[PDB]
């Protein structure tokens with residue numbers, strides 16, 4: 001069993017990103033999302049699955065999906081931004097298992113990732129615990 | 143724009159179901175989940191989409207996915223229980239747009255629905271506001 | 285250090301009680317409230333303090349404060365209902381340390397308590413773990 | 427009826443502040459705290475009361491209480507940090523109605539305020555909507 005505990009840091013009081021969706025991919029006996037002491041906790045039944053969090057800033061028409069999981073017994077992450085209305089977390093989470101551009105991100109098994117949207121706002125995931133069954137990450141909204 | 147505001151009632155102190163997942167289908171400009179004044183609020187960009195909530199009772203190894211949406215300008219709902227580990231809300235939400243028996247449930251445009259798991263516990267959805275753009279439902283756990 | 289983990293069971297879809305306030309009394313090095321896996325977790329720095337949760341049903345003009353704590357190394361609980369607008373949880377929590385009718389409830393060190401409001405709705409606290417540092421209780425709204 | 431809607435910004439991945447307490451003062455028919463679309467919403471029955479939020483970073487042994495209210499029909503705010511274990515939000519909220527220095531902070535009717543703890547970290551409140559019945563503020567953690 002794996003857990004990834006995520007601390008969300010929203011660093012800029014221009015716009016406001018709120019949580020809107022949390023998904024579990026179906027491999028590795030699935031998984032769950034829990035809120036624990038102000039943190040998001042993704043629990044997974046084995047290696048080879050993932051879960052996604054979508055955040056939306058309605059004030060500024062910005063959004064992103066942050067995905068966390070374990071691939072071949074190593075943690076991975078990705079961020080997708082500049083979303084169309086059709087790119088829910090349900091959509092994006094599932095794309096990591098069959099869409100080549102997404103598969104490759106997962107296969108990279110990254111301990112950290114940062115991306116900017118069209119407006120220049122940066123978003124980052126940084127794992128603070130990178131090994132073992134109980135992983136930890138900061139999700140940083142610039 | 144539709145909202146469906148959901149109040150959860152857990153009616154017996156036998157087992158404890160906790161929220162674990164909330165998904166948005168991609169049709170009709172997608173949608174979001176918000177927590178508002180103790181209720182789960184599904185917001186959708188128009189008619190023809192839906193969102194799902196999964197709840198798990200780890201104490202009693204029970205779970206269910208409740209789905210809410212609007213089909214041809216009328217609200218609908220369904221519950222799936224007896225879930226396999228591969229049946230996350232991500233999976234179940236999508237099945238209402240391709241799987242005949244699930245398609246049929248959506249097409250039923252029900253204001254209320256119930257189903258029991260193999261353990262004999264019943265779950266129900268009851269829309270208390272069945273018309274207009276701000277719909278309301280009780281999710282009742284037996 | 286003591287914890288009391290509380291599972292809220294809202295059993296009747298007549299009215300809707302939502303969480304509106306959570307307080308910590310100042311004795312025994314204070315305490316905190318956390319949300320953990322859908323449960324409310326009161327953590328206290330020693331014996332002799334408590335914390336309160338207030339719930340309000342705006343639909344039906346009903347409300348109550350449920351207080352949990354440890355007195356002389358034994359758990360206690362109380363429920364106050366039929367609240368005036370001036371009886372916030374901040375008010376009620378503090379009354380257990382100087383108001384005789386409230387002091388006596390605390391001194392009773394109850395493992396369970398049930399009360400009805402003027403409308404006849406029952407509210408109950410039942411501790412499911414009654415000894416040790418990590419206590420557990422159901423809060424049942426009738 | 428006033429609402430004050432609060433957005434929390436945690437600006438540095440150094441430490442992690444989590445919500446631990448939310449209180450309502452008893453004047454002006456009291457008030458409530460709700461979570462709405464990722465924001466903390468304080469609702470008050472009129473002018474002359476307030477509510478407090480406490481946040482704790484156990485990682486770095488830091489904490490603060492942020493208080494928001496309306497005094498003589500104008501919004502006010504304060505932050506207290508360098509908290510003792512006996513300074514819960516329950517305690518601090520009440521001090522604004524009897525303790526001269528706290529009374530004075532309320533009487534200041536500030537649209538913005540900041541204070542630093544002994545560790546050099548600054549906290550701020552910034553009202554983004556300063557007039558009317560639906561007030562809005564940023565709570566910024568430095």
Ligand SMILES: [C]C(=O)[N][C]1[C](O[C]2O[C]([C][O])[C]([O])[C]([O])[C]2[O])[C]([O])[C]([C][O])O2[C]1O2[C][C]([N])C([O])=O
Nearest residue numbers: 026027028029046047048049070071072073097098
């Ligand atoms: C171990 C790992 O991690 N692996 C992975 C996977 O996962 C899996 O899946 C399956 C189905 O297919 C099941 O669910 C199980 O349980 C699990 O584990 C997957 O995810 C993939 C993607 O798709 O990846 C990984 O792997 C690699 C290769 N391809 C193989 O297969 O092996």
Ligand SMILES: [C]C(=O)[N][C]1[C](O[C]2O[C]([C][O])[C]([O])[C]([O])[C]2[O])[C]([O])[C]([C][O])O2[C]1O2[C][C]([N])C([O])=O
Nearest residue numbers: 168169170171188189190191212213214215239240
């Ligand atoms: C109106 C309605 O409801 N409709 C519906 C739909 O939705 C839709 O979808 C599309 C794509 O495909 C888009 O997204 C839009 O926007 C929306 O609106 C769908 O859902 C379906 C299922 O699949 O159902 C309904 O419809 C029916 C038929 N198809 C016709 O149209 O009519």
Ligand SMILES: [C]C(=O)[N][C]1[C](O[C]2O[C]([C][O])[C]([O])[C]([O])[C]2[O])[C]([O])[C]([C][O])O2[C]1O2[C][C]([N])C([O])=O
Nearest residue numbers: 310311312313330331332333354355356357381382
């Ligand atoms: C041990 C116990 O539990 N005790 C109690 C108390 O608590 C206390 O308090 C103090 C102040 O005063 C401090 O804070 C400490 O820390 C603690 O512990 C109290 O609470 C009381 C009520 O008021 O009760 C109990 O006790 C009994 C008697 N009175 C004595 O004092 O001992």
Ligand SMILES: [C]C(=O)[N][C]1[C](O[C]2O[C]([C][O])[C]([O])[C]([O])[C]2[O])[C]([O])[C]([C][O])O2[C]1O2[C][C]([N])C([O])=O
Nearest residue numbers: 452453454455472473474475496497498499523524
């Ligand atoms: C209008 C206003 O804001 N006022 C104020 C007050 O509040 C009040 O209180 C009372 C009792 O005491 C009752 O609760 C009512 O309802 C309310 O409104 C108070 O808070 C104070 C502080 O202590 O402050 C203000 O005022 C001032 C003076 N005292 C005169 O009046 O003016």
